[PDB]
Structures are given as C-alpha cells and as structure tokens.
Amino acid sequence: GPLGSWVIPPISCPENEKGPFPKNLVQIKSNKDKEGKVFYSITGQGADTPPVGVFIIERETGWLKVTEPLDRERIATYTLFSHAVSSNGNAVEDPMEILITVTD
C-alpha cells in the first residue's frame, strides 16, 4: 500500500517565525533505510513549483525545512509529496502526499 515503510509526523508551521532559517519542521523517514541507503526529495507548490523553495528536504537525512517566514492570509496551506530512492535511482516508496498547515 501507499504507506509502504513511510514514517512521517503531521506538519504545521506558525506564520512569522523567527530565524535562523532554514528551520527544521519534521524528519521524513523510510523504514526501507534498513535495507540500504534511502535518498529523500519533495515536490509540490512551495517546493519545486511557485512559490519555489519555501520548503526543502535534506537528501541524506530527510530533514524537511522551511526557508523563510510564512504568512497565513497569503497561503494558509501547502501540499507536497515526499519521495524515497536508492542509490540506483529506484523508488523505495510511493510518493506520499504531505499536508503543511500554517498556524497562528
């Protein structure tokens, strides 16, 4: 199923956060990291399409980071997808849709 070996906490970030940026939100994890290295990426609006790069993921460690303060009455939500590959480029997981809620 879509779950696969995904392990991911719910994601909601306050608007007007203080630096320093980038700021860690959650660590995205595949439990297939037990068979070998997994490499992490994200796609979606806020990620690879406008506004690009509001969210980034560290490609060894799966740290999902916001790179600037958010404003709730501009975009109150964001939908991304996570991705896990092996050294070989192979998907070890089915991309997971991630909801990021901007909070008070």
Binding site: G1, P2, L3, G4, S5, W6, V7, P9, P10, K18, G19, P20, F21, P22, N24, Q27, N31, P50, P51, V52, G53, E58, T61, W63, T67, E68
Partner: protein, 461 residues
C-alpha cells in the same frame, strides 16, 4: 553612483529578469521607458526573489535601498551592493555566490541571509557588528573567526558546513537561537558561555559530552539527533525544555528526563532504552518517538493521555495494550515487533496512520471500525505455532481472519499440502520437523490500504 539624464531601464538594469521587475517597480509600461535619478531615489525596498536573476548590475543606482530580497536567483557577482550603506536587511539565499567582499562595509545590516551559496571565506562579515540575524547554512565554511565581534547576534545558523572549532562564539552572549548542525563538531564547551540560548540545534554531529549545556537553563528547544550521546544527566537542569530531540544516539538512562514536565515533543528513537518509567510524568507529550530501542514493557506509556503521535517500531514488544489508553492517537507505528492481539486498538477512534507490519497479527476483526485510517500497513506477519504431533496425514486449522471476519485462504502451503476451509491437511510419508503456509490478501480499512500477508510455521514432534 547616480544617473544624470533620463535613461532606459534596460540600460541601468542589464539583466532581462531585473529590468522586467524594475519596469513594474518604477511604474512603466516598457523596459525601454526612461527614468531619472529621482524616480530611482524613491525605491527603498525590493522583492526580486525567484525571478531567475543572473546579475544585479544597476542596483547601485538605488541609493536609498534599505531592504532587499534577491533569494532563489542565479546571482554570483554581488559587487553592485558595495556602496548601498543604507541597507539594513539582505535575503540572498540560494544563489551561486562565492565572493562576499562587496558586503564588507554594509555596516548598517541587522539581517543577512546567505544560505545555499558556495561561500568559503566570511572574513568580509567581520565589521558587520549591527547584525542580529545571520544565516550561512549550506556553504563551504571551515573557519568562523570572522563571527567573533558580531556581538549583537541573536539568531545564527551555519548548519551543513565544515566548522569544527566553535571558539569564535565565546563573546556572542546575546545569542538566543543557534544551529550548528552537520559540521564536524565534537566539542561544544564554548556553548556554556551562551547563557541566553533558547534554541540550540546540533543534529548530525559527533557530540558525546553535554555537560557544557548545564547552565543553559533558558533552553526550550534542543536537538541533538545523530550524535554519540549516552550520559544525559546534564539535561535534568534544563527544566524549560519543551522540545527535545535525542534520536540516533546511545542513550539508555532516561531518569534525567523525568522532571522535564514541560515537554510536548520527545524523540528518542535508535537508542539503547529498555526502561521508560522515567517517562511517565511527562503527561504534556503529544509526540513521542521510541522506535529502534530495546523495549518490552511499555506500560509507563499509558499515563501519556495527550499523545497524538507514537513510534514504537523495531523493539521487542508483545503486549501492545498500554497504547489503548491513548485515546487521541492519530498516528501509530509498531512495525517489527511481536504483537498478536490487536483488539485493544479498537478504542483508538482517532487513528489515521496504523503501521503494524512484521508483527504476529492473525486477526483484523478488532480494527473493523477504524474508519478514519488513510494509511495502513499489515504485511509480512509471522508466527510459529506450538508444535503438534507428526502423523502422515497431519492437519491444522487456518487461523488468519480478515477484517470482515472471514478466514483468508492460504496463498501457498508447504510440502504439497492443501486447504478446505477451515483446515490445512498434509500427506507426509516420512517424519518432517515442520510444515508451513503463507497468506497474502489486499485489504482496505476506511481509506488505508495494505497487503495483509504472513508466514505461519508449524513444528512437528
């Protein structure tokens, strides 16, 4: 630096992307329409992020600029910034910037954002003493000596560089928020000076000694994920902590955590813990992560009435029933344990993520009303029956029951055996020590879909 006579925008701003912007910013229909110096003087802020800008030639003529965002461009050269001394704030992350000497005299700066460039030498920062926020992650900095007089700093990152030596932080006693993650940091003794630290992030380093943190009593967030921590006795002094990340270390003794009752997130996965009794008064937890340890008795967890997120995967757990107390669980992970009876999970009305693969689960009926599930996992169960006596015609009951309450027919059956509900029947000529069977059955509960699968071993006497 100033234009005299009306001049086409596209002749001040040589960048296609940037003349396009400055056309609008200055209020003009065409990139060729002229502007004078007075037009240019009135631009005091500029948001030119994410415009694919390759050059900022021309920005020197905006002498009254106080605040700029050119993040997420393709800038390398930033020399047109040299004389813009009224600048107070620069956001310039995610460029291809190598040389920052043009910043050297931008003495009025309070905010300087340079992460994701290719910067090595930060010596041009040294005179920027009005700085209170500085961000330098994801560059190639080995030496932070140039931060030593930056004694107005409050917020400071240089995660993901190659800085071992934190000595140059010693006098930055104004710091409140620091990130030193992914560096080659072993020795955090200097951080003992940073008495005003409220947030410290130091993931993916080589820190084994945390006694420097002891007098850092204003810390409310600490992340020491992926270190070589074992003795965390020091943490018992940090009573303001609300967010503690200690995953991927060597920690077994949690008693120093017991009094840290303001914690709402604790991460402790991939450690060496068998005892979680020190955790039981932390009733304000919403997130707890306890995966990849040595757990068996998780009964201390029943106290933690507020948890919405719990990880428990890769332990030695048989009795899952303490979690049934935790009425507000939305995501539960226990892949790779020894759980059989999942019926206590019945009282988890709010569960969305149920991750229960590689356990000893034969019966899904008690999960039938868990209809908010949107992510499910149940594959690769296994169990070994108590042995039964070898007979040439030995037979055992299929016990594997789907969520509907119907038995799932075996997928395969060893030794040429065969099935007629409910029974599996072998036809075995000579003694054999064991027979087996597999099952594999796609299933959806609410909206979470998995394959429920397993291998059942039957030893024979």
């Amino acid at each position: 630096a100033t234009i005299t006579q009306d001049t086409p925008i596209n002749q001040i701003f040589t960048d296609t992307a940037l003349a396009e912007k400055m056309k609008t910013v200055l209020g003009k229909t065409n990139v060729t329409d002229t502007v004078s110096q007075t037009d240019l003087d009135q631009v005091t802020t500029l948001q030119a992020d994410r415009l694919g800008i390759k050059s900022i030639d021309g920005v020197e003529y905006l002498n009254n600029l106080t605040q700029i965002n050119f993040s997420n461009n393709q800038l390398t050269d930033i020399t047109p910034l040299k004389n813009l001394t009224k600048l107070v704030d620069i956001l310039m992350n995610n460029n291809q910037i190598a040389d920052i000497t043009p910043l050297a005299n931008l003495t009025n700066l309070t905010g300087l954002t340079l992460f994701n460039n290719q910067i090595t030498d930060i010596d041009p920062l040294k005179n920027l003493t009005n700085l209170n926020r500085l961000e330098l992650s994801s560059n190639t900095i080995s030496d932070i000596s140039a931060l030593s007089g930056l004694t107005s700093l409050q917020q400071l990152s240089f995660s993901s560089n190659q800085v071992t030596d934190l000595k140059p932080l010693a006098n930055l006693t104004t710091l409140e928020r620091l990130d030193i993650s992914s560096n080659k940091v072993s020795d955090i003794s200097v951080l003992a000076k940073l008495t005003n630290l409220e947030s410290l992030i130091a993931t993916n380093n080589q820190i084994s000694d945390i006694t420097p943190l002891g007098i850092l009593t204003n810390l409310d967030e600490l992340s020491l994920n992926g270190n070589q921590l074992k003795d965390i006795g020091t943490l018992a002094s940090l009573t303001n902590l609300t967010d503690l990340d200690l995953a991927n270390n060597q920690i077994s003794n949690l008693a120093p955590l017991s009094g840290l009752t303001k914690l709402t997130e604790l991460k402790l996965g991939a450690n060496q813990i068998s005892n979680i009794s020190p955790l039981a008064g932390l009733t304000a937890l919403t997130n707890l992560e306890l995966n990849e340890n040595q757990l068996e008795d998780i009964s201390p967890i029943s106290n933690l009435k507020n948890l919405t997120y719990l990880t428990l995967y890769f332990n030695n757990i048989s009795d899952i029933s303490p979690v049934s107390s935790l009425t507000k669980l939305q995501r539960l992970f226990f892949y790779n344990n020894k759980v059989s009876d999942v019926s206590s999970l019945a009282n988890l009305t709010n569960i969305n993520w149920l991750s229960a693969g590689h356990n000893q689960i034969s019966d899904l009926t008690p999960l039938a009303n868990l209809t908010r599930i949107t992510q499910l996992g149940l594959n690769d169960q296994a169990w070994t029956n108590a042995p039964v006596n070898y007979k040439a015609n030995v037979s055992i009951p299929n016990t594997v029951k789907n969520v509907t309450g119907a038995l799932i027919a075996p997928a395969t059956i060893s030794d040429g055996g065969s099935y007629t509900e409910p029974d599996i029947t072998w036809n075995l000529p000579s003694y054999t020590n064991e027979v087996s069977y597999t099952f594999s059955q796609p299933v959806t509960i609410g909206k979470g879909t998995t394959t429920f699968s397993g291998t059942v071993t039957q030893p024979l006497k």
